[PDB]
Design an enzyme around this catalytic site. Structure first.
Site, PDB file in Angstrom:
ATOM      1  N   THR A  44      88.996  37.984  76.538  1.00 23.61           N
ATOM      2  CA  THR A  44      88.157  39.100  76.952  1.00 23.61           C
ATOM      3  C   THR A  44      87.178  38.650  78.038  1.00 23.61           C
ATOM      4  OG1 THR A  44      88.200  39.872  74.640  1.00 23.61           O
ATOM      5  CG2 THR A  44      86.569  40.843  76.105  1.00 23.61           C
ATOM      6  N   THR A  45      86.610  37.471  77.837  1.00 20.29           N
ATOM      7  CA  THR A  45      85.566  36.968  78.705  1.00 20.29           C
ATOM      8  C   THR A  45      86.139  36.646  80.074  1.00 20.29           C
ATOM      9  OG1 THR A  45      84.505  35.984  76.764  1.00 20.29           O
ATOM     10  CG2 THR A  45      83.712  35.272  78.933  1.00 20.29           C
ATOM     11  N   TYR A 108      93.403  50.251  71.403  1.00 19.54           N
ATOM     12  CA  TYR A 108      93.718  51.604  71.859  1.00 19.54           C
ATOM     13  C   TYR A 108      94.751  52.363  71.018  1.00 19.54           C
ATOM     14  CZ  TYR A 108      94.866  55.577  74.813  1.00 19.54           C
ATOM     15  OH  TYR A 108      95.088  56.853  75.284  1.00 19.54           O
ATOM     16  N   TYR A 134      92.688  37.346  66.285  1.00 17.21           N
ATOM     17  CA  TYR A 134      91.422  37.655  66.935  1.00 17.21           C
ATOM     18  C   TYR A 134      91.028  39.085  66.606  1.00 17.21           C
ATOM     19  CZ  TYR A 134      88.202  38.482  70.897  1.00 17.21           C
ATOM     20  OH  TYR A 134      87.148  38.807  71.720  1.00 17.21           O
ATOM     21  N   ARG A 139      85.882  46.583  69.932  1.00 15.06           N
ATOM     22  CA  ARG A 139      86.591  46.709  71.200  1.00 15.06           C
ATOM     23  C   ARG A 139      87.991  47.296  71.058  1.00 15.06           C
ATOM     24  NH1 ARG A 139      85.062  43.936  75.899  1.00 15.06           N
ATOM     25  NH2 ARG A 139      82.947  43.051  75.774  1.00 15.06           N
ATOM     26  N   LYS A 163      89.723  34.276  64.820  1.00 16.15           N
ATOM     27  CA  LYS A 163      88.433  34.377  65.472  1.00 16.15           C
ATOM     28  C   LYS A 163      87.840  35.702  65.063  1.00 16.15           C
ATOM     29  CE  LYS A 163      86.657  35.119  70.343  1.00 16.15           C
ATOM     30  NZ  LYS A 163      87.154  35.150  71.718  1.00 16.15           N
ATOM     31  N   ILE A 204      84.699  30.068  69.520  1.00 19.72           N
ATOM     32  CA  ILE A 204      85.180  30.399  70.848  1.00 19.72           C
ATOM     33  C   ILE A 204      84.025  31.159  71.471  1.00 19.72           C
ATOM     34  CG2 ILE A 204      86.853  31.750  72.192  1.00 19.72           C
ATOM     35  CD1 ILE A 204      88.854  31.092  69.802  1.00 19.72           C
TER      36      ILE A 204
END
Ligand SMILES: N[C@@H](CCCC[NH3+])C(=O)O
Ligand SMILES: N[C@@H](CCCC[NH3+])C(=O)O
Ligand SMILES: N[C@@H](CCCC[NH3+])C(=O)O
Ligand SMILES: N[C@@H](CCCC[NH3+])C(=O)O
Lengths: 295, 295, 296, 295
Positions: A44-45, A108, A134, A139, A163, A204
């Site tokens: 994501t980052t 989504y 994850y 999100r 995570k 992370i």
């Protein structure tokens, strides 16, 4: 086979709209030299959403190549809300020398728990390298339930942990109580220490992009059961750990990296964009309190 | 120019893992012949997430062509969480004869309200056809605020309203109280009526895949302010509406289309999959109460 | 500041035929004392503060105070209310009847603003000269005492000395102690006793300790002594009971457990609280089998 | 037996800390003279929390006395988180001539559905007047499930419906779909119209303290199926409807009544207190747009 310890969710620096590959390699080397155990390209980052599949691939390759001849592992970002895409990314990471993959819950389309199970099973069966789940419902719009995670960990040899970025300490307790073999990884910088002191085995991190020495030291102090020292750094980091989310990650971390002179250009790909001038000021102010390692 | 009235979020039938193009065309024909004012290819209900960009583009083509020579418009699904992908889909839709586009808010990467504005402005400026925004925070992890929706409606000539799938009637009141010139479209069958009865100008329905005649009548009765008759149909639709969401859309709708013999196989792309046996049975049970039109 | 910390029990209030069983209550408290508990909390949430009348509430405080007299065990009296005049009344009662301090829950239902919370606790703190521990439980009250508000009260009011956190928000716990490390952070949820203690928290106000006072006390003191290996051992042993003791709203499971262990005579609540489902009843019974439960 | 139509959750005025009983009667008369069908003494809006039991009973008596001879009903606030207290209040109200009671879900102690069922059953069985359930999970920390509400309506003759303040239109649909004999009452001013147009039969209103004529009108226009008019008022009222919750009710409504000269002093009982200057400004600003009836 596992990937744990202090890890960095790498930012992806852009210059004139394209990945600045020299910058990327240089930032990765900076992580390596500051004691980080693993890097995560294109999470994501790293703006996975706006990189094309081929750019995504190139970034993974640069991470592997930059980490070659070092002990730093590459936990490649390989998640997708389409299983066929996630499988494609997983196979690529495997074929190109990544040490494992990080695979975000489908966003989504809100699959059912059964669907999540088949999603991750298809992925884990496609490669023979460790897969880290994850969970980030804020999100993705879905959550991998505790039962599904445990089931995935038990049914699939290479699925080795999760995570967590769900802001749910209780679930973290549940996970490790029911399945103490799994690796719980903090996806939430502000609470790195509590997660580690409570049985987690790595992070992370977003913050480690800027302060890799501090995050590495924190994580190692805790894994060594030096809780006093780990808590101390966690406490020191709290302000920046929170401010780095004043706007959606990675808008603040990229802003800080730029302010610090670690990247040349403050560029995102839409729909991500520069922070408001107010948050830019806020980020600048918090940043002054910390010693930021250079190259 | 606008695209309103009764609209159908087309499911995307697969046969052996591939888009069943003839079936797709046939299903659209069926909608045309049942009074639907517009069809929406490759929205959420059409599994936009798991179609490649090519399949996505192919479905838009099939719709446009199938609707040629009829009154029925094509509101092309063109949303993405990457602005560059969304612009390409918008431009493709425009260049291939779509009447307009539906563009969902960026999912997963959580852009700021400023980012959402620039995202949609870039999309709006890339084509001259009507653009309907699409708000579904339960899926995207972000909300287009009422302020942002209204500014975009006002600043961009071709942005003409929004599909709301947030189950928030307060917001629907807010939008139309402050800006009654926009076309508010219901994106959730459960509250088509509440929205229509508050000055909404249409629906983008899931239920209309199975029951296009009922949804159409319901919508036109409301548009004619014949609320006695509209609510009458809406009450009849309660059971099907409720069951069509016992699992994440479009799991139930496809299952129902299959039970109804309208598609050949109950196939999804992972991470979506068949419903639980219990829900399969419930859906089948509920359908008995309804007169389901064939081809 | 003077303080009340360490291992503390949120006492259940046993009922017999719908009335407070005062003898049982006193006997239960003596058991806590004899099992190493540092302080007892009469008439907190676990003690069904909501359904006790004001006079019953006061009787329970008196019984706890008198029972602990002549021992080392402190009494941190439940004195919260969503009405400031009621809260001040209970605080003054607790003070005048010899309680060592008070626990005062954030106003529930009427959802005051942060300024209102500040005025509420400021009035409570000014009314007595004994320690006051704030008590944040947004899941129940519909409001949160902000970290800013807590720290301000801690700093402005001589006798406000910390907060019992029952919010499952570890981030908040870091926030509190990172910015104000002088305050006493007290765990108000057994499931996160260890997370809070390992982050510099200085005690617990426990539900589980009703049933297993010896284990909670040892867990707390091991952690306070920085013996994290032993503390963790115990916390891990405690997982099952902690989890099941919240299968339904506290104190529904704890009273059920106390009854099954023969520590209370009847399984009685005041409505709207009631017996757990039979299924949860059975689950609780099974889980208890794994634990050594001290008698009287 | 039912109590429906336009109803007002009465504010309770204080003067030097004591209930201002003359002002209270005067405010009640004002409601009565403005088309209101029933008043609710000592609900949330009337600061039930900070009144003593004796003051609470006094307010009930004042309401009954002032309404006597008028056809305006008194739906007495008789809720508590302790079943014995709620029973006490219910009995007091019946014995002193109230027409029914409003009984909020127990707050703070989070009873189970079974406990909530037993709570309300005991209340309903203690009196022979109508009992209206009151769901406001944002304040209570618990919810009366749809299933529990339906059971109570069916099992207890005098429980006739529910005031919903959960901003969940879907639940409102469910409730009336499964049990169309129940009276659904709006406890959320901003969406009074949507609730009424969707089968609701009344409102218990905060806004009506200030604008009783407009709330009454809106309600009656809707009950008479004049949706055009009802919606119009609803739209007009949106701004005041929203601003009345810029701070926790009844802080804004009391501020507005004071600004309108309807109460002598802006006094609350702690922990409630005066709004911020800024919010005071907002409320005063919004009020100018409206014609506020006097005494
Ligand atoms: N933007 C799409 C495709 C990205 C593919 C490359 N990372 C998504 O977020 O899933
Ligand atoms: N799975 C990616 C790619 C979609 C490709 C176009 N339908 C996404 O949902 O954004
Ligand atoms: N049931 C009311 C009164 C409590 C009386 C003292 N325990 C409340 O929860 O505030
Ligand atoms: N403050 C307590 C007591 C109220 C007394 C009756 N109005 C409560 O909110 O339940």
């Amino acid at each position: 086979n596992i990937i744990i310890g202090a890890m960095t969710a790498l930012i992806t620096p852009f210059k004139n709209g394209k990945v600045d590959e020299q910058s990327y390699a240089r930032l990765i080397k900076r992580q390596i030299e500051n004691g980080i155990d693993a890097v995560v390209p294109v999470g994501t980052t790293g703006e996975s959403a706006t990189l094309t599949h081929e750019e995504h691939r190139t970034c993974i390759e640069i991470a592997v190549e930059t980490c070659k001849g070092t002990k730093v592992k590459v936990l490649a970002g390989a998640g997708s809300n389409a299983t066929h895409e996630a499988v494609g990314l997983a196979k690529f990471a495997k074929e190109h020398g990544a040490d494992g993959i990080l695979s975000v819950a489908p966003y989504y389309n809100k699959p059912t728990q059964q669907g999540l199970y088949e999603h991750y099973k298809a992925i884990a069966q496609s490669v023979d390298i460790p897969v880290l789940l994850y969970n980030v419902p804020g999100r993705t719009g879905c959550e991998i339930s505790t039962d599904t995670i445990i089931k995935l960990f038990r049914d699939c040899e290479n699925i080795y942990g999760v995570k967590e970025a769900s802001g749910n300490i209780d679930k973290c307790v549940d996970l490790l109580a029911h399945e103490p073999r799994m690796m719980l990884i903090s996806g939430e910088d502000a609470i790195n220490y509590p997660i580690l002191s409570n049985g987690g085995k790595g992070v992370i991190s977003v913050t480690s992009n800027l302060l890799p020495d501090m995050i590495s030291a924190l994580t190692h102090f805790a894994l060594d059961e030096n809780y006093k020292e780990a808590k101390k750094i966690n406490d020191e980091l709290y302000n920046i750990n929170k401010i780095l989310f004043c706007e959606s990650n990675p808008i603040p971390i990229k802003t800080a990296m730029y302010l610090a002179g670690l990247i040349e250009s403050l560029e995102f790909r839409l729909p991500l964009c520069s922070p408001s001038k107010e948050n830019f000021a806020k980020i600048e102010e918090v940043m002054k309190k910390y010693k930021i390692k250079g190259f």
